[model samples]
Target: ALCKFCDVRFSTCDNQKSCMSNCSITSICEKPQEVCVAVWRKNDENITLETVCHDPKLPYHDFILEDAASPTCIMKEKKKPGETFFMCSCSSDECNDNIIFSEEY
Candidate 1:
């Protein structure tokens, strides 16, 4: 499996939505069936995007896998007291490139 790999950071004032535009890196999973995850976090509008390949069949991914193990990427928000978050995962190659954010409101 392959996934977009990057840690994108932009100013809090910038209205940048998708970080994929500035990212062109890709990661080939060390093992088969590794799922691709796109994690977006917003703290006072300072956006950060982290995309990587993970093996959901393992123990560490158990919690997020509940939302990630899907045919199409579903950005599942795991709200916290300090920051806003949405994690999307998919099976196809570089599927993390497509992230759903604007419709979240």
Candidate 2:
């Protein structure tokens, strides 16, 4: 059966759902076991996580793995040595709802 998912995210401000301007119930042709995901990262003070539908066939899917695999692969380092990396993927409805990073800077 097709899977249905919604849009969700985190940001420095209270900009929830701002990035999901066109967001709506997304239906995927993949099996229900397939997952929709959201991944976000920031250097110091803030990190962001957002959830939405994902297509495995797309090239962006590779970014998820690459981002999760290595920091250098996902983000660019700043002169002050600030960098962040994150990625999330799941195989269920609304699976990417809440993400928490408990890393101390």
Candidate 3:
């Protein structure tokens, strides 16, 4: 299923029955599974792995190796005005790495 970018919720269509305005259930980050959950539970005072899974934001980022893979978020970098690189990754945080052009390797 396409990850809902604009609105996200933890419960499925049956339970919640609507889009959640808060980031509690959205998979905003991808590299780490608990990023979204982490942000949600940051104020809980009782941070634990159990809480993370119980939250809606588990498995924050899911990556695909195929060209047809559709990611929830996108990342792109530019070395010059015309030179740019686009990579489809699960999370945007991973895009901070040194710019690697298609011709480099």
Candidate 4:
């Protein structure tokens, strides 16, 4: 599948929620990348955004990855320590743009 490839260091805070608007670079996954992924991290002090192609069929963080079939990436918190770490996935070409942040407690 086709996905946007950009590292957090190369991306800017101007479009932290939209990877497509922030990055023009693209990548084609040689293997099974059923979904496009966007890893976001920020705390109002520091922020990061990285987009890539990933395989939901594979294991992620020692757990099974789920399909982000939604048009807007739903950002779910993984772990936080004075900061928020979110990772979302979507099923479309360079679809890691719109991200919906949700505080799950």
Compute the lDDT of residue 8 as modeled in candidate 4. Answer: 63
Which lDDT tens digits does candidate 1 get at residues 1-105?
878777554423124454452447887988897888777777874777777777887533235466455655666677566787777777888888766554443
Per-residue lDDT over 1-105 for candidate 3, one digit per residue giving the tens place of the 0 to 100 score: 112232312321111112222332332333333221111111123311110211123222332223222222222322333222232222222221112222333
Best by TM-score: 1
lDDT of 4: 0.65
Per-residue lDDT of 64 in model 2: 33
TM-score of each: 0.73, 0.43, 0.17, 0.70
Candidate 3 TM-score, true structure as reference: 0.17
Model 2 local distance difference test score? 0.41
lDDT top scorer: 1
* Residue 11 lDDT in candidate 2: 57
Q: Per-residue error at 10 for model 4, in Å?
A: 5.8
**lDDT per residue, candidate 4, 12-51, as tens digits?**
5443333443767777766764677777777777777778
Better of 1 and 2 by TM-score: 1
Query: Looking at candidate 1, what is the lDDT of residue 87?
Result: 74
Q: Rank the candidates by TM-score, best first.
A: 1, 4, 2, 3
